[PDB]
């Protein structure tokens, strides 16, 4: 009743909002057997991973909230869809179609919606391409505050880390869920620093979807700074999330290069508290799926206005190898919105900025 992988687990702080879990069934789709237990175990272990990382970074035992209906059992919404499975495929807006239908379901049942974040899980298609040994066919990506992942018969934590086809399949699809959930929880891609890579392994939002459960995987300071400002990690019920627009004035920005060091400083002013500054340094190209390489840093601010100061060591920029690089400054607000400013440089023609 308790898998071995959950025997080591921490008590977590109650949160003001919880991640919704929807098991999304096409009108012609049968659940994968034993999904309530299998997915509860996997989700509770995922919750442990995120909560232990938040604690290790100084935020206390805070994870994404889950609605628990009995010991070891998540309150999963089993949703029977209006249309057959073929109507909500990975491609061509299948995920948006599912999400719109769930918007209708939550409008008609607002008691069952516990936050603005939802993880939708669909069973694998079973055809000539996909099946229990090669899951796929369904949405599998982040979509705003929503994210999509899948289920299949061996999607069971008992295989975690095992040197078997089931174990390798699990790290692929469980690591995948962990990473897509990160996107759903407002996380962009980022890469571990050189020092963190040596101590803690592979960043989950970098290539950690390939390592989760098999080799050491972790969450960066910058990811934890965003989770600190994510609705389902809130221990402050007075705080409302994601309303309005990010309003930050950023002035007197200086970026200077002195030996091996990158100096970043400036001032900020917001009507909201500014929780933190994340700094991302990456090689081109810069699209939202060409940024697995962005090495990230974070600094706590915690005021509505003030100055920021940061020295970044170039030797921590593990993996970067382009003459051209971009520094992004991301200001994270208390309501979970953020704004960014970008600056591009060239190592062979380094120009201090303002
Ligand atoms: Zn991703
Ligand atoms: Zn890049």
């Amino acid at each position: 009743t308790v898998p071995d992988a959950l025997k080591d687990r921490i008590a977590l702080k109650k949160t003001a909002r919880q991640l919704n879990i929807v098991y999304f069934l096409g009108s012609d789709t049968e659940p994968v057997p034993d999904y309530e237990r299998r997915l509860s175990e996997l989700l509770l272990y995922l919750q442990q991973f995120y909560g232990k990382e938040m604690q290790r970074h100084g935020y206390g035992a805070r994870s994404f909230g889950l609605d628990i209906k009995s010991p070891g059992r998540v309150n999963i919404i089993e949703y029977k869809a209006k249309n057959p499975a073929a109507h909500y495929p990975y491609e061509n807006g299948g995920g948006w179609k599912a999400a719109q239908e769930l918007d209708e379901f939550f409008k008609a049942h607002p008691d069952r919606k516990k936050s603005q974040h939802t993880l939708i899980i669909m069973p694998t298609w079973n055809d000539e391409k996909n099946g229990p040994d090669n899951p796929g066919g369904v949405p599998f990506y982040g979509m705003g505050r929503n994210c999509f992942a899948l289920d299949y018969p061996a999607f069971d934590i008992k295989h975690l880390g095992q040197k078997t086809r089931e174990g390798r399949l699990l790290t692929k699809w469980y690591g995948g869920m962990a990473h897509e959930l990160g996107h759903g929880l407002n996380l962009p891609h980022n890469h571990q620093t050189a020092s963190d890579g040596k101590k803690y392994g592979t960043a989950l939002m970098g290539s950690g979807n390939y390592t989760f459960g098999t080799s050491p995987t972790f969450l960066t300071p910058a990811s934890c700074a965003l989770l600190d400002a994510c609705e389902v990690f809130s221990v402050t019920p007075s705080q409302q999330f994601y309303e309005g627009k990010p309003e930050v004035e950023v002035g007197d920005v200086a970026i200077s290069f002195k030996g091996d060091q990158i100096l970043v400083s400036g001032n900020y002013k917001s009507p909201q508290t500014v929780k933190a500054l994340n700094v991302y340094i990456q090689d081109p190209p810069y699209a939202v799926n060409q940024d697995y390489d962005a090495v990230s840093f974070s600094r706590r601010l915690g005021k509505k206005s003030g100055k920021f100061s940061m020295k970044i060591d170039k030797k921590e920029l593990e993996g970067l190898n382009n003459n051209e690089f971009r520094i992004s400054l991301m200001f994270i607000l208390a309501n979970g919105l953020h704004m960014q400013k970008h600056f591009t440089f060239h190592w062979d023609a380094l120009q201090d900025y303002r």
Side-chain angles (χ1 to χ4, degrees), residues 1-6 8-90 93-95 98-99 101-103 105-106 108-162 164 166-242 244 246-248 250-287 289-306 308-354:
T1 312
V2 176
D4 293 341
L6 279 164
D8 170 346
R9 64 177 186 277
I10 58 168
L12 300 160
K13 275 154 201 203
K14 151 213 151 285
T15 59
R17 294 298 193 266
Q18 292 78 39
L19 176 76
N20 314 296
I21 313 295
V22 178
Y23 201 64
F24 188 102
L25 300 171
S27 69
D28 65 329
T29 308
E30 291 306 310
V32 184
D34 218 2
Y35 81 86
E36 282 201 64
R37 167 188 73 78
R38 289 182 299 97
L39 295 178
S40 299
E41 291 168 355
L42 292 164
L43 288 167
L44 287 163
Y45 185 92
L46 197 45
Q47 188 187 48
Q48 283 294 310
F49 172 80
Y50 275 80
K52 289 169 170 184
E53 284 293 293
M54 290 296 280
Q55 181 182 68
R56 183 180 73 75
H57 286 96
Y59 300 95
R62 282 168 65 211
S63 193
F64 53 89
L66 287 174
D67 181 0
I68 306 295
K69 63 178 177 180
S70 64
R73 290 300 182 266
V74 183
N75 195 10
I76 295 165
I77 299 153
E78 174 174 313
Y79 176 82
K80 195 68 177 182
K82 273 151 46 135
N83 292 291
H87 200 284
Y88 323 83
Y90 179 89
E101 214 177 300
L102 289 174
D103 284 326
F105 174 92
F106 280 135
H109 293 94
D111 56 288
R112 299 223 68 177
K113 196 187 195 186
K114 305 292 197 186
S115 78
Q116 314 179 57
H117 293 265
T118 300
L119 167 61
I120 303 126
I121 302 173
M122 298 186 199
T124 182
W125 286 16
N126 298 287
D127 51 31
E128 310 87 10
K129 178 173 152 279
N130 293 123
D133 310 292
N134 187 251
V138 303
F140 200 99
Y141 27 72
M143 222 198 72
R145 324 272 174 213
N146 295 326
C147 46
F148 295 84
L150 58 70
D151 191 24
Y152 59 96
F155 198 47
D156 187 312
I157 201 173
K158 73 199 202 179
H159 301 302
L160 192 66
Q162 305 286 326
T164 63
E166 293 77 15
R168 297 188 286 277
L169 271 174
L170 186 63
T171 279
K172 175 176 180 183
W173 293 105
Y174 192 31
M177 172 185 278
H179 174 111
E180 304 299 342
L181 175 57
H183 286 319
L185 300 173
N186 323 317
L187 300 191
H189 295 136
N190 64 357
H191 190 283
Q192 63 273 4
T193 64
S195 294
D196 276 3
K198 284 201 269 275
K199 295 183 296 230
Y200 311 118
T202 302
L204 173 62
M205 298 313 300
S207 48
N209 51 342
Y210 293 94
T211 60
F212 196 92
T214 296
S215 70
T217 311
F218 78 105
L219 285 163
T220 60
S223 303
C224 288
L226 284 155
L227 300 171
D228 173 58
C230 167
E231 186 189 43
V232 292
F233 291 70
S234 177
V235 301
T236 309
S238 55
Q239 182 69 69
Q240 308 310 305
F241 285 83
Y242 315 137
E247 288 165 21
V248 191
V250 180
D252 206 12
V253 175
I255 300 166
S256 300
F257 304 90
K258 304 303 139 180
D260 268 1
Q261 302 297 313
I262 299 165
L263 280 62
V264 177
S265 58
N267 305 312
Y268 60 97
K269 171 174 149 144
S270 185
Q272 317 191 47
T273 305
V274 183
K275 286 280 206 86
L277 163 73
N278 288 351
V279 180
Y280 299 85
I281 307 189
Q282 73 168 301
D283 294 336
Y286 307 111
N289 263 247
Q290 308 173 312
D291 56 350
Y292 303 94
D293 70 300
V295 183
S296 62
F297 307 83
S298 184
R299 192 120 152 200
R300 226 158 295 202
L301 299 178
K303 294 192 261 204
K304 301 195 230 314
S305 69
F308 55 92
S309 210
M310 188 180 330
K311 270 201 211 171
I312 292 166
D313 193 325
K314 171 183 197 286
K315 298 187 289 301
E316 291 287 350
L317 296 176
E318 179 176 275
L320 298 196
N321 64 357
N322 200 296
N323 181 57
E324 176 173 305
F325 62 107
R326 194 175 81 173
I327 302 181
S328 297
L329 304 187
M330 180 196 278
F331 294 85
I332 301 163
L333 305 183
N335 84 328
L337 298 184
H338 65 252
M339 75 103 54
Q340 320 191 39
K341 304 292 229 223
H342 309 277
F343 307 86
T344 305
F345 306 88
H346 294 89
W347 288 111
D348 68 354
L350 272 180
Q351 254 191 94
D352 293 347
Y353 174 85
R354 274 223 304 280

